[PDB]
Design a protein around this nucleic acid. Structure first.
Lengths: 50, 44, 136, 175, 112, 86
RNA sequence: UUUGGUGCCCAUGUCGCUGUGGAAACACCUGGUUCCAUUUCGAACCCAGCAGUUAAGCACAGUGGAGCCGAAUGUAGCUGCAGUGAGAAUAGGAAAGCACCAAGC
RNA sequence: CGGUCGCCUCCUAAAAGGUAACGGAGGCGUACAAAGGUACCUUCAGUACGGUUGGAAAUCGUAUGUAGAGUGUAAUGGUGU
RNA sequence: UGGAGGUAAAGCUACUGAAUGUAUGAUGGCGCCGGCGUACUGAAUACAAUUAAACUCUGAAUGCCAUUUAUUUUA
């Protein structure tokens, strides 16, 4: 009964693209990744959007 | 990195002897007043 | 009386004892034994009664051996209650007896003494007992 | 150089004493180990720094720590949090540490009567415990006061303790 | 607890198990064994557990380097219509003599 | 008579999901047909078979399926499929 | 045959105990400068060479000491007074077997 | 009145699978930026011997022993290169 | 004919929890001056032997999955 989902999108194409589990109390530093996108046909950096 | 000692002698002034395999480099040829050869109870 | 001290389970199922016996089909230590010709369930209190009778009629001259031990614990739901509400509570420990196996054994005492001792101990058991000699 | 001295004279000397037909059946030193017992990591004194400092000033070799491998609920210990120190060394350093131990440190013991308790385990290994904290020449005073010493081990290529004892006695080991 | 020789056999065995479990398409294997003196190569075809051919310094050639062994056996496989090989490291690392042999195999028209 | 005799304290039980033997030797099997379900690994994947993340055994190439026995005390089973050949 | 390498088989292929041998080789070995390397170190990986080696690995010959397999009969269980067949254990067995490449008989 | 209402593990369940009772026993409403992926390297726990702190038990070396070690957990199965 | 299984039974130095006698007795307690006798409790070991739904080194028949020959239904 604890909220753990977090949505991630890019900054070059601006769409919420992925969902993942992430604990705030274990990773205080904000997660960032690099993943493929379905609207620019390339791999781009992704950060969470709250 | 680490203390890089090299080939330095090893003298006993009370036994008047010199040996060397490895010793301290910062003060070459350290003097020691008691050793195994100098000690009479060491040999027996 | 003779009871185990702990078990991984508190209320196990029952066991059938039909068919021929398994294990303890022949004497091991004592010279004369008491075999059972009927399978049944015997508690440790009857075993205690048989043992004390054997000891009293024996004297500090011979020796006796018990061949079984209660490894099972049945339940008995308290009186004047309705059916259901799970299983009841345990209040005795019982050793299953299969027909054709020995219960008690004795040695090192004259023939009349051992025969009368086994006969005295036999009536305390709810099974049809029979005397037996060592197979040699 | 005691290495050449052993490889030329003592080796053949023991081969002629234990008259066999192979030169490497004659006992040889396998590895040299230095082991530090540390307990102030849980007491929060200097976090293993004392052992690392001492081992740096004794060894002509880069020190490296070791970690607990058990769940030790006595004070507080489980799976990490480096306690003790470990060094395994080879080559010329073996003879260097051997000659150091047998010429500078052990003869300087205030109450020295030899070191022998039949510490052989019967598979050809001996262990020697240097009790006092600072007794070596390369280690200078005014470092630390936490009580600890040295635990060296002489290990031979075979499992016969008598051959190892003969090798050590022929290589000037105080007994 | 090992003897420096049982370890080599053990790691060769773990690699062999990996190759046998992984394969879904059939490609012949080129096993290589490095010894104290010299090296050897063996071209094995699977699905039959048999060996086509082998090469080494025991064929009256110089010991190791020796990259010529990495070519002739390659020419052995192309004359038997085999261009899709998998390079085994045996019980060793992909480096040195092994890397030299791999480049020798690569440069004469083999695909791995 | 009436008495509040209760205290069951447990009646929970999970729904059983079927598993075990779903196919047998001697039948032609097209690819993608699951052969054996298990919680664990009691049938090692042999040749021309694949393993899914539920450790689910399935086939990749067509042919007749067969089981083989091996192991340290001969107690391990392998499933394999061979191409339809005469 | 021997002899190294490796494949499936994985104890009747195991753990040991005692002797035998190394030409070609496999290994011990000689050293860390070249590639590579240790939570550190030529211990292992890797280089470049063969002074020595039967010690060990390794292979032969024995060893039934331990570990393992287990005959025949009888019996327990079950299917319609007859088929079915266990387990424990017994007398016994076992110091692997089947292919492939290369050297040299 | 008392207890329970969803999901998971074993037995009850009678060697396909499945099967009930207010049956016997236990858990879950997560956790992981690495415990995921990959390449590479490596292998039990305990016990005994021997050595300074160091006692049953810290650490180190050796030997032994065929999993009683571990597997993010309840149980089961699986897992000794 | 092939194949999977893990119960019926059987066994408990083949683990898992229970225990029986004897040989060794650890470790204890009692008494007694680190040590000692123990009318005694006794872990671990070797020997003879026990029990199980939740123990299995091992392990049936029957039933079940499909193919083979032959018969038959058109389900």
């Amino acid at each position: 009964a604890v909220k753990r989902s977090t949505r991630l999108g890019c900054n070059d194409c601006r769409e919420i693209n992925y969902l993942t589990f992430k604990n705030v109390k274990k990773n205080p530093e904000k997660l960032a990744l690099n993943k493929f996108c379905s609207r620019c046909r390339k791999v781009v950096v992704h950060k969470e959007v709250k | 990195f680490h203390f890089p000692s090299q080939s330095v002698s090893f003298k006993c002034a009370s036994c008047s002897n010199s040996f060397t395999i490895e010793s301290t480099l910062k003060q070459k040829e350290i003097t020691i007043d008691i050793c195994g050869k100098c000690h009479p109870f060491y040999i027996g | 009386m003779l009871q185990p001290k702990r078990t991984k389970y508190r209320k196990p199922h029952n066991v059938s004892y039909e068919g021929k016996a398994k294990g303890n089909s022949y004497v091991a230590f004592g010279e004369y034994g008491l075999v059972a010709t009927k399978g049944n369930w015997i508690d440790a209190r009857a075993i205690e009664s048989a043992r004390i009778a054997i000891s009293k009629c024996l004297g500090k001259t011979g020796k006796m051996w018990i061949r079984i031990f209660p490894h099972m614990s049945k339940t008995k739901k308290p009186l004047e209650v309705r059916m259901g509400s799970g299983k009841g509570n345990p209040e005795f420990w019982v050793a299953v007896v299969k027909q054709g196996t020995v219960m008690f054994e004795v040695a090192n005492i004259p023939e009349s003494q051992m025969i009368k001792a086994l006969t005295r101990a036999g009536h305390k058991l709810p099974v049809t007992w029979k005397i037996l000699k060592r197979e040699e | 150089n005691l290495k050449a001295h052993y490889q030329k004279t003592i080796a053949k000397e023991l081969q002629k004493s234990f008259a066999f037909s192979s030169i490497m059946q004659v006992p040889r030193l396998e590895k040299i180990v230095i082991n530090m017992g540390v307990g102030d990591a849980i007491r929060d004194s200097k976090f293993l720094e004392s052992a690392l400092n001492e081992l740096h000033l004794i060894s002509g070799q880069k020190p490296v720590a070791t970690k607990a491998k058990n769940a030790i609920s006595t004070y507080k210990l489980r799976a990490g949090q480096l306690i003790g120190c470990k060094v395994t060394l080879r080559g010329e350093r073996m003879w260097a540490f051997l000659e150091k131990l047998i010429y500078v440190a052990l003869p300087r013991v205030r109450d020295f009567r030899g070191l022998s308790l039949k510490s052989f385990d019967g598979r050809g290994n001996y262990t020697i415990g240097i009790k006092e904290q600072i007794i070596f020449p390369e280690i200078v005073y005014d470092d630390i006061k936490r009580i600890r010493g040295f635990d060296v081990t002489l290990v031979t290529s075979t499992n016969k303790d008598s051959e190892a004892l003969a090798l050590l006695r022929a290589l000037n080991l105080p007994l | 607890m090992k003897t420096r020789t049982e370890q080599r056999r053990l790691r060769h065995k773990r690699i062999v198990k990996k190759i046998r479990a992984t394969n879904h398409d059939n490609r012949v294997v080129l096993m290589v064994i490095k010894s104290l003196n010299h090296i050897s190569v063996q071209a094995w075809d699977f699905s039959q557990n048999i060996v086509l051919a082998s090469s080494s310094s025991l064929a009256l050639k110089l010991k190791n380097n020796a990259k010529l062994v990495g070519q002739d056996i390659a020419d052995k496989l192309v004359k038997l219509k085999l261009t899709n090989v998998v390079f085994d490291t045996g019980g060793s690392k992909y480096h040195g003599r092994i890397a030299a042999l791999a480049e020798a195999a690569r440069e004469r028209g083999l695909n791995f | 008579s009436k008495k509040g005799v209760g205290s069951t304290k447990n009646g929970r039980d999970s729904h059983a999901k079927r598993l075990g033997a779903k196919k047998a030797d001697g039948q032609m099997i097209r690819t993608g047909q699951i052969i054996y379900r298990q919680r664990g690994t009691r049938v090692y994947p042999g040749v021309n078979v694949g393993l899914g993340s539920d450790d689910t055994l399935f086939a990749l190439s067509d042919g007749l399926v067969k089981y083989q026995k091996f192991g340290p005390k001969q107690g391990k089973t392998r499933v394999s499929v061979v191409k339809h050949k005469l």
